[PDB]
Design a binder for these strands. Structure first.
Ligand SMILES: [Mg+2]
Ligand SMILES: [Zn+2]
Ligand SMILES: [Zn+2]
Ligand SMILES: [Zn+2]
Lengths: 141, 263, 133, 196, 114, 559, 85, 168, 49, 43, 159, 65
DNA sequence: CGATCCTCTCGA
RNA sequence: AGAGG
């Protein structure tokens, strides 16, 4: 229908993209202080618009809660981490004959999820547990 | 009526909201500790697996079985197998349960705690019956079966305290709070603007009198009034949780006394 | 020994300074024209308001394990309100005949300026600061 | 590991009684160190916690998605209505003594991962065992019951300490050691060793 | 694998005694009682009750390592009072305090309805 | 390199390590398994005979046991399969390979073994559980933490080999490092955090807490120190019961800033006879500092005496803190309502100064100083304004964080954290750089295709206005990710490079040693230094001392 | 040849940590290999702890041969070396 | 002023002050001849080398030159009495303690210095951060810093990356 | 839940790792250092399908 | 599994560094540390 | 550049001065220039200092730069250590690098050198020239599994 | 993979609550929060056990074996 | 020549 | 050689 299109890096060179669809094309004439400070759209000669900013990441980072509130390398480390974790890798484990396989007894879906996780399944085949954690210095152990 | 005073606010089949007045902190805490892991009960300690054709592993099921709450009313009328003179277990030291279930219908067959049946001599003791609190009367869902599926196992339930394994607790969360005004200054409150506005008042504020800002801090004062709520898991009734709680502590203290006599 | 000092002081200013239980007090003598006093007080226990006049003293008795109070023959040089134990750590000769004393009550410091502290203080781990009404 | 690039092994296991408790009776399943926070600057960890506490209570999923309008103030707003103090803190009592902690604890749910690599799968020790075919030195790998390497880097450390007689033993009596018959003329290992 | 048996926390070992009394070398009239297969449940309770007795000079407890089920109690008394008997007396009072609690909670329970 | 300079060895072990606050400095927690696996060849003497015969009796499966009994003629007796393993009446001269037991000397190591302090002798303490247990104050020389790190343990087999460990390589002997003439180990983390806390002037303790605290010190005299307070409620200061861990004859003096012997800020340090007089104890005192408690206690009272210190310091602090707690909440990053406005105003004026400097450059009224490009002058100035802003907004945060601020508290103790961390989390993350220049035009004439061409603005070239608490935008995110990646690359490049560099030195200086005339020479016997270090002095025994004749006026010198 | 005169020697009269460690070791080895003990081992039983006692009492009959780069040596008896460290 | 030297003198003076319980109100029992000749006889005993010949004795004099400046500066006649207020008993002990500590502070023949020095440079280098020049507060201060610079040096690079000349 | 995209080679599941390469037929210019006798170069990575 | 199936290898001027153009095509975060950091990337 | 220098009174005071910073080296030609201090002129190129002012001046420069890389990263190391390295490079007459071309080419042992780089080539060069090892090197004894003349074995035990 | 018996944290019998929960959301049309409150799971430690549960058994049951 | 070590499965 | 601490 021509409402959406595929752009490669070469063609990207010639276009002007908007990050948010609404927050990037309104009008001009108080604000939430807790919210992040976003720059005004300024240039208004758009050819395209981002489907959703979050789509710059992939499988790995799309599992991280609030990566936009983390120091750059921490997000890269968590990217290696999830791969070294364990849980229900597939429903058919009972049926497969794999050299080494670890499955969680009682896997839990995160209490805090990414909209991306839906497509990633995750909530369906988890890798962790919603542990009640205390940040405190107890026995020094 | 002399010494430590008790005042029950609320009482139910599995909950006791009381006020332990005129007691040292150590006392209220040690009793809280003993109620968590030292009051004995009955729970599955062995599982013999004849047939398992289910999606769940033998030990996964065995694990779940151990957690299953069992009537532990007359537990002092049962021995620890370690004390029993018998080869392995018996009727004086253990309750044997059977569990045979098969996928009858094409429709998914659920294996409940009600499906566990005693195959040992109880000797008129209120012991080994699986605790069912479920309104439909099924209790804990142990496993799920398809059609060709079947589970046939035998399990020996033994006596124990939670200190050995969490499954052995009449447990559940135990509410504990002393001084709902910090009149003792036992905790320095964290804030941004004002502690009173950002910290919420606990229901126990109703009973105690507020500090009254125009008064200096009570130096020599000590904690004696304790607000507590003991929750029963079902193995033992609530009254008995606290009573056997008091008892176990009392018992293990008297053992230290007759230990001095021996040496 | 017996009391080695006795003077009624007048509070000039009260300062918490990042603390909530401790307060550094600035006091001046009611009798002497030069005798100054600067000391830390556990205000949570004994509140020291502005424009207060307090009787300060440094005794020596009322070495071995500290025995708890106990309701016995126990009678201390305490008829007072606020009592501390300290240690001498420095003695400053603030020119001419003016002397300065330095006592630490386990962190709660003390500074007393005067002249007549001759047969009063020595470099001893002994100090007993009694303060009343 | 938490979902914010910070691994860790279990230090110790404490049973419920010893564990610090809340005025409700809630207890941690895990205790993390306050020091493993500022150096790394993982605020999302603290936030992912705050959101999960509010989530479990309300009975709703936590929108932890990145480029959103979800604020700490917003999450806090609800949690404060949901009874608890808005910043994740809770008054806790020491399980040993039963006395309140002077410091309030940042408590609440946080999704953690069970990581592959477990103590027992790594524990290894070898007081003499199978030798290599060629080099006559200990074999490689724990499954083969091999030896830990005493590299050049470790030989340096010993040569720094001055421990010469240890360094010899660690390279002779432990590992390979051979007695060869040397020619008093050649200086070679071409001597017919006809012992006994 | 290297983990001990969970009963080793309440079950006394082969040739193990619940109370081991040793004379304190650092000071006169003091004792170092070692409690085997006991924790803070008992430690704190006894020590807090010892402090209630006026004739007690010093009373403190320490569990040197969490892995182990031991606990060390140290008692110093006034001249003419055996600290072994100080344990006895304090330790006795605890039973009485609990005895009162039991019969008082029981009175309240029957008075309540549900 | 593989089979001669280095090699796999016997009587070695490896496992995941974990810290233990109830372990001594020179101790190592060896799991039973490993302790059962490793042996020592002990010859049968009349002094040992009784214990050894009892050890043989226990056998390979019971811990204080043994496997293998070597007879005269060197024929071994495998105890797990010997028919007469129950028999065996030991004879003098026979060797008994006994299990590794408590208080045995063992070489503990962590790779990369970059300096001698990475490889130290320890006292064995056989424990249950699967991990290699160790004192936290040994974390630094070895360079470990407990996020999964494993360590190597080797066991000496000769009587003379075990001497070399205890007499030269022992943990207390290695406290004062020759490398930096300062101690290499100090009080860390919780202890470093909790010492500061307990030792505050405001901090006071009751009868009950004091006694348990005193009894926790092992080498305690047994005498209750007199309470600092003897009025309604006999109270004690933290400063007091901590001074119990400090030994006799210990004298320490500091003076930091507002330090006036009457110290209003409770800063600096005064320790006399081994009792604390004033000041708060922290990193400068109880850390691995040049003039701190440790360099003093080691040199003054002894290495064995000093090693014992950490333990006592840890036992009192840890206990106190265990019964006090301390967290880190998200609230600790939530800086003031009006304080945020000032931080936001800072970025506002920072952004304006750039706009102006840009407008000025675009107008050709910018005349760059000698040596640097008109354009490179612009960049330098812009970067400078933004860095100033980030620092200022960050200083605005710090100067608002309450004393009850958990983050600030660690930074104050020096346990963890720094200013930048506060700044970035609560105020403003700041500018991102790659190749030292700001975010470059990867796309023709732009950084991102969501911006117009020729956009030299802060936000276009990678300035993160937002804090970590507020969160980064999609642009800010990618830019930070670009900068973050650089770090990650030149960490891997540095660990590769520094590693090789090390080996190269270590090979060139290998054979260099002090001879029996203080001559620093090689294996050929060629003089490098006629006197070592130019004085013929050992590097550890040295310490910075002010030379009072070099400075001051000629008038002051005479007086 | 080679040697050095007894009252003509510049090497430290003090025993190095290395000379101590090696001496303690060599003796402990002898003690453990059922060799005579030249001091009353009042209480003691560890061969190294015994070697340490023998040293403090100065009853160790061993001589340190200190080598000089040129190929010369100074002979210092354990019974004469200062042990300050 | 502050420079790494064996024997912390401040501590010894503080030790004697505590050990002998020095009172700042009583006059000392020391002669000017005692202090002057004492500190003088002390430095003659602060040995590093022992050789009877000229060269070694000059080398010995040379080795201790700087330490003696501290000794002399700290143990001057005025200081000993005016500041320290030391008695003879206390002062004599100080001299023995200084010598004791100095002889203790010396290096041990057999000490493997090469390996030490190498690891002493190596280990710190292995901790270095930010390849982008630290001394560069401005672009006109962008000189090679960190590991790239350290590599340049160790390799004795004929083709120096940022060659600069600082002219006075 | 299985996505495919892999191969089963002797019962073992193999993923073909996508390989990055510089695209051909592209015209590019590169400035040559300083010891070089030639100042600039124009290159083409010519190849057929 | 999914993250393995979306891996990209670059063999052997400066690559490694998250280039501007990588926006929306390669993940900024998901990359290994050391060995081949940045050469191994993920879509 | 701020310079701490003694005042007429004697006490040290900061006297800020003007210093010229270059982008290139021709030291020999810049020191022979009017209106400068030729006694003070520095270069980050210690190799030129060596060529213009001699080996001994090169040593002082080599260190000044080594110290500077360590110091720049906030770190402190004791003088003796880098003093040794600096001296090691210097003690040959010229600037001997810590590369396979610098120290590993010097007239030491043969088993001593092969342990670093060029392993086989070193052993082959020992083939042609009939090399002799004193075995007073660490590596040689380490290779031969002998108690090397290190701390413990740096002397002998008699009776 | 089947509703854990008893809450990991506190131990409240949760192995029975599941079927009732799934019907409270279906037939009763209730929201998870009120449904968790209806079953007596007051503390969040309990709440996460039921809320956060993924009952994978229903998928494994689907295989014929 | 290009840090150390550690587990490891897999052709040929 | 590759996969990963
Ligand atoms: Mg690590
Ligand atoms: Zn039985
Ligand atoms: Zn021959
Ligand atoms: Zn719960």
């Amino acid at each position: 229908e021509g409402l959406v299109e595929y752009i490669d890096a070469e063609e990207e060179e010639s276009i002007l993209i908007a990050m948010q669809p609404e927050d990037l094309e309104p009008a001009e004439a108080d604000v939430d202080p807790a919210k992040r400070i976003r720059v005004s759209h300024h240039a208004t000669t758009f050819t395209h618009c981002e489907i959703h900013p979050s789509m710059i990441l992939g499988v790995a980072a799309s599992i991280i809660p609030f990566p936009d509130h983390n120091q750059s390398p921490r997000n890269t480390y968590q990217s290696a981490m999830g791969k070294q974790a364990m849980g229900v890798f597939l429903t058919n484990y009972n049926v497969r004959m794999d050299t080494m396989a670890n499955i969680l007894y009682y896997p839990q879906k995160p209490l805090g999820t990414t909209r991306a996780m839906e497509y990633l399944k995750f909530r369906e085949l988890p890798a962790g547990q919603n542990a009640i954690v205390a940040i405190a210095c107890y026995s020094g152990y | 009526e002399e010494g430590p005073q008790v005042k029950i606010r609320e009482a139910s089949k599995d909950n006791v909201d009381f006020i332990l007045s005129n007691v040292d902190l150590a006392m209220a805490n040690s009793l809280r500790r003993v109620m968590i892991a030292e009051i004995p009960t009955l729970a599955i300690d062995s599982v013999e697996v004849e047939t398992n054709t289910t999606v769940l592993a033998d030990e996964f099921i065995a694990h779940r079985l151990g957690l299953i709450p069992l009537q532990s009313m007359d537990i002092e009328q049962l021995e620890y197998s370690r004390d029993c003179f018998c080869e392995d277990h018996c009727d004086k030291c253990s309750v044997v349960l059977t569990l045979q279930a098969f996928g009858e219908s094409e429709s998914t067959t659920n294996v409940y705690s009600k499906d566990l049946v005693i195959v040992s001599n109880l000797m008129g003791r209120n012991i080994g019956h699986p605790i069912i609190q479920d309104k439909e009367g099924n209790g804990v869902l142990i496993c799920k079966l398809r059609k060709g599926q079947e589970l046939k196992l035998t399990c020996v339930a033994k006596k124990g305290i939670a200190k050995e394994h969490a499954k052995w607790g009449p447990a559940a969360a135990i509410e504990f709070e002393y001084d709902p005004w910090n009149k003792l200054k036992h905790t320095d409150y964290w804030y941004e603007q004002d502690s009173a506005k950002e910290w919420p008042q606990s229901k126990n504020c109703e009973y105690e009198d507020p500090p009254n800002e125009g008064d200096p801090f009570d130096y020599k004062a000590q904690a004696d009034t304790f607000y507590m709520n003991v929750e029963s898991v079902g193995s033992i009734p609530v009254d008995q949780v606290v009573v056997r709680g008091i008892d176990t502590l009392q018992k293990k203290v008297a053992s230290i006394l007759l230990a001095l006599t021996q040496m | 020994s017996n009391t080695l000092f006795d003077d009624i002081f007048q509070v000039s200013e009260v300062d918490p300074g990042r603390y909530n239980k401790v307060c550094r007090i600035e006091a001046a003598s009611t009798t002497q024209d030069q005798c100054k006093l600067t000391l830390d007080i556990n205000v949570e226990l004994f509140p020291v308001a502005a424009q207060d006049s307090l009787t300060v003293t440094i005794a020596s008795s009322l070495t071995r394990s500290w025995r708890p109070p106990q309701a016995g023959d126990r009678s201390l040089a305490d008829d007072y309100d606020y009592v501390m134990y300290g240690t001498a750590y420095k003695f400053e000769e603030v020119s001419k005949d003016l002397i300065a004393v330095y006592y630490s009550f386990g962190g709660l410091l003390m500074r007393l300026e005067g002249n007549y502290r001759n047969l009063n203080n020595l470099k001893q781990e002994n100090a007993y600061l009694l303060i009343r009404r | 590991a938490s979902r914010h690039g910070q691994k860790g092994t279990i230090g110790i296991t404490y049973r419920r009684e010893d564990m610090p408790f809340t005025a409700e009776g809630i207890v941690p399943d895990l205790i993390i160190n306050p020091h493993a926070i500022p150096s790394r600057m993982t605020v999302a960890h603290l936030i992912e916690c705050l959101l999960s506490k509010v989530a479990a209570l309300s009975g709703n999923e936590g929108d932890a998605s990145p480029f959103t309008d979800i604020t700490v103030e917003g999450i806090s707003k609800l949690l404060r209505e949901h009874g608890y103090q808005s910043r994740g803190f809770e008054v806790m009592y020491n399980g040993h003594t039963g006395k309140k902690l002077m410091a309030q604890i940042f408590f609440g749910p946080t999704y953690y991962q069970r990581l592959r690599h477990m103590v027992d799968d790594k524990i290894h020790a070898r007081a003499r065992g199978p030798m290599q075919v060629l080099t006559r030195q200990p074999v490689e790998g724990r499954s083969r019951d091999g030896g830990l390497r005493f590299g050049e880097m470790e030989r340096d450390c010993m040569i720094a300490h001055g421990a010469a007689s240890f360094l010899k033993e660690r390279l002779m009596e432990a590992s390979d050691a051979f007695r060869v018959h040397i020619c008093g003329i050649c200086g070679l290992m071409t001597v017919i060793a006809k012992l006994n | 694998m290297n983990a001990p048996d969970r009963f080793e926390l309440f079950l006394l070992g082969e040739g193990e005694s619940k109370l081991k009394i040793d004379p304190d070398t650092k000071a006169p009239n003091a004792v170092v009682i070692t409690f085997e297969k006991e924790d803070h449940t008992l430690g704190n309770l006894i020590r807090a009750e010892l402090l209630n007795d006026r004739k007690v000079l010093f009373a403190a407890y320490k569990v040197e390592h969490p892995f182990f089920a031991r606990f060390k109690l140290r008692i110093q008394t006034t001249e003419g009072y055996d600290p072994k008997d100080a344990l006895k007396n304090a330790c006795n009072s605890i039973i009485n305090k609990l005895g009162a609690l039991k019969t008082n909670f029981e009175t309240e329970w029957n008075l309540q309805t549900l | 390199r593989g089979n001669l300079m280095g090699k796999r060895v016997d009587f070695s072990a490896r496992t995941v390590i974990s810290g233990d606050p109830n372990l001594e400095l020179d101790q190592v927690g060896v799991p039973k398994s490993i302790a059962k696996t490793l042996t020592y060849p002990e010859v049968v003497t009349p002094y040992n005979i009784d214990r050894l015969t009892q050890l043989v009796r226990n056998g390979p499966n019971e811990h204080p046991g043994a496997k293998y009994v070597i007879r005269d003629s060197g024929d071994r007796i495998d105890l797990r399969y010997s028919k007469r393993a129950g028999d065996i009446q030991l004879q003098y001269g026979w060797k008994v390979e006994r299990h590794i037991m408590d208080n045995d000397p063992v070489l503990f190591n962590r790779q990369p073994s970059l300096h001698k302090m990475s490889m130290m002798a320890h006292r064995v303490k056989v424990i249950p559980y699967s991990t290699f247990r160790l004192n936290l104050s040994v974390t630094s020389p070895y360079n470990a933490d407990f996020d999964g790190d494993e360590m190597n343990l080797h066991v000496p087999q000769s009587e003379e080999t075990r001497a070399e460990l205890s007499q030269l390589c022992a943990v207390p002997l290695q406290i004062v490092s020759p490398q930096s003439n300062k101690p290499c180990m100090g009080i860390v983390q919780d202890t470093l955090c909790g010492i500061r806390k307990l030792t505050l002037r405001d901090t006071f303790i009751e009868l009950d807490q004091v006694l348990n605290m005193l009894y926790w010190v092992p080498d305690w005299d047994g005498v209750i120190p007199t309470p600092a307070i003897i009025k309604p409620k006999p109270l004690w200061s933290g400063k007091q019961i901590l001074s119990v861990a400090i030994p006799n004859g210990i004298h320490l003096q500091r003076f930091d800033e507002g330090t006036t012997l009457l110290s209003p800020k409770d800063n600096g340090m005064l320790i006399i006879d081994g009792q604390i007089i004033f000041g708060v104890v922290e990193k400068k005192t109880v850390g691995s500092s040049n003039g701190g408690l440790i360099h003093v206690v080691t040199r003054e009272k002894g290495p064995q005496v000093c090693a014992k210190l950490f333990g006592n310091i840890q036992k009192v602090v840890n206990f106190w803190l265990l019964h006090n707690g301390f967290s880190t909440g998200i609230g600790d990053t939530i800086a003031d309502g009006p304080t945020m406005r000032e931080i936001t105003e800072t970025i506002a004026e920072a952004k304006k100064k750039v706009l102006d400097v840009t407008k000025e450059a675009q107008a050709n009224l910018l005349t760059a100083k000698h040596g640097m490009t008109l354009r490179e002058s612009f960049e330098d100035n812009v970067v400078r304004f933004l860095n100033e802003a980030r620092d200022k907004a960050g200083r605005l945060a710090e100067v608002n964080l309450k004393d009850l601020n958990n983050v600030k508290q660690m930074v104050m103790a020096g346990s963890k954290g720094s200013f930048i961390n506060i700044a970035q989390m609560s105020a403003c993350v700041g500018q991102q750089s790659v190749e030292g220049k700001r975010i470059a035009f990867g796309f023709v004439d732009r950084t991102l295709p969501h911006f117009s061409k020729d956009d030299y603005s802060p936000e276009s070239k990678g300035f993160v206005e937002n804090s970590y608490l507020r969160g980064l935008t999609p642009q800010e995110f990618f830019f930070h990710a670009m900068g973050g990646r650089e770090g990650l690359i030149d960490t891997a490049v540095k660990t590769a490079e520094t590693g090789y560099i090390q080996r190269r030195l270590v090979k060139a200086l290998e054979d260099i040693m002090v001879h029996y005339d203080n001559t620093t020479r090689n294996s050929l016997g060629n003089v490098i230094q006629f006197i070592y270090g130019e004085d013929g002095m050992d590097a550890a025994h040295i310490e910075k001392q002010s030379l009072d004749t070099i400075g001051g006026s000629d008038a002051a010198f005479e007086k | 040849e080679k040697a050095i005169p007894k009252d003509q020697r510049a090497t430290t009269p003090y025993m190095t940590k290395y000379e101590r460690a090696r001496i303690l070791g060599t003796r402990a080895l002898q003690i453990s290999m059922n060799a005579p003990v030249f001091v009353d081992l009042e209480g003691e039983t560890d061969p190294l702890r015994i070697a340490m006692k023998e040293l403090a009492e100065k009853k160790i009959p061993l001589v340190i041969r200190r080598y000089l780069p040129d190929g010369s040596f100074e002979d210092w008896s354990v019974e004469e070396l200062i042990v300050d460290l | 002023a502050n420079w790494p030297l064996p024997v912390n003198i401040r501590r010894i003076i503080q030790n004697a002050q505590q050990t002998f319980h020095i009172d700042h109100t009583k006059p000392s029992d020391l002669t000017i001849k005692d202090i002057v000749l004492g500190v003088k006889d002390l430095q003659e005993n602060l040995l590093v080398l022992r050789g009877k010949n000229e060269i070694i004795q000059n080398a010995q004099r040379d080795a201790v030159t700087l330490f003696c400046c501290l000794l002399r500066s700290r143990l001057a006649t005025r200081r000993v009495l005016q500041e320290y207020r030391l008695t003879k008993q206390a002062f004599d002990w100080v001299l023995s303690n200084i010598e004791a500590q100095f002889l203790r502070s010396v290096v041990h023949p057999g000490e493997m210095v090469g390996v030490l020095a190498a690891q002493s440079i190596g280990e710190p280098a292995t901790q270095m951060t930010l390849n982008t020049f630290h001394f560069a507060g401005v672009a006109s201060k962008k000189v090679t810093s960190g590991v790239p610079r350290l590599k340049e040096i160790l390799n004795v690079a004929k083709n120096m990356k940022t060659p600069s000349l600082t002219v006075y | 839940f299985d996505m495919g995209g892999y191969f089963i080679i002797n019962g073992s599941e193999k993923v073909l790792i996508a390989q990055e390469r510089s695209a051909g037929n592209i015209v590019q210019v590169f400035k040559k250092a300083a010891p070089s006798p030639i100042s600039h170069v124009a290159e083409i990575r010519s190849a057929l399908e | 599994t999914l993250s393995h199936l979306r891996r990209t290898n670059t063999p052997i001027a400066k690559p490694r560094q998250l280039h501007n153009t990588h926006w929306g095509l390669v993940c900024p975060a998901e990359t290994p540390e050391g060995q081949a950091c940045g050469l191994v990337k993920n879509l | 550049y701020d310079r701490k220098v003694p005042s007429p009174t004697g006490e040290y005071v900061k006297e800020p001065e003007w210093v010229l910073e270059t982008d290139g080296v021709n030291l020999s030609e810049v020191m022979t220039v009017p209106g400068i201090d030729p006694t003070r002129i520095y270069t980050n190129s210690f190799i030129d200092i060596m060529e213009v002012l001699g080996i001994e001046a090169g040593r002082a420069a080599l260190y000044k730069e080594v110290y500077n890389v360590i110091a720049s990263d906030g770190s402190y190391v004791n003088y003796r250590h880098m003093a040794l390295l600096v001296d090691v490079m210097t003690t040959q007459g010229g600037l001997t690098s810590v590369t396979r071309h610098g120290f590993n080419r010097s007239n030491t042992g043969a088993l001593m050198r092969c342990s670093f780089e060029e392993t086989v080539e070193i052993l082959f060069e020992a083939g042609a020239s009939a090399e002799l090892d004193d075995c007073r090197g660490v590596s040689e004894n380490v290779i031969l599994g002998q108690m090397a003349p290190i701390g413990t074995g740096a002397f002998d035990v008699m009776i | 993979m089947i509703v854990p018996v008893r809450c990991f944290s506190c131990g409240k019998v949760v192995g029975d609550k599941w079927e009732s929960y799934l019907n409270l959301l279906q037939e009763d049309e209730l929201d998870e929060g009120t449904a968790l409150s209806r079953l007596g799971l007051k503390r969040y430690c309990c709440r996460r056990m039921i809320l956060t549960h993924v009952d994978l058994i229903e998928k494994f049951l689907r295989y014929n074996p």
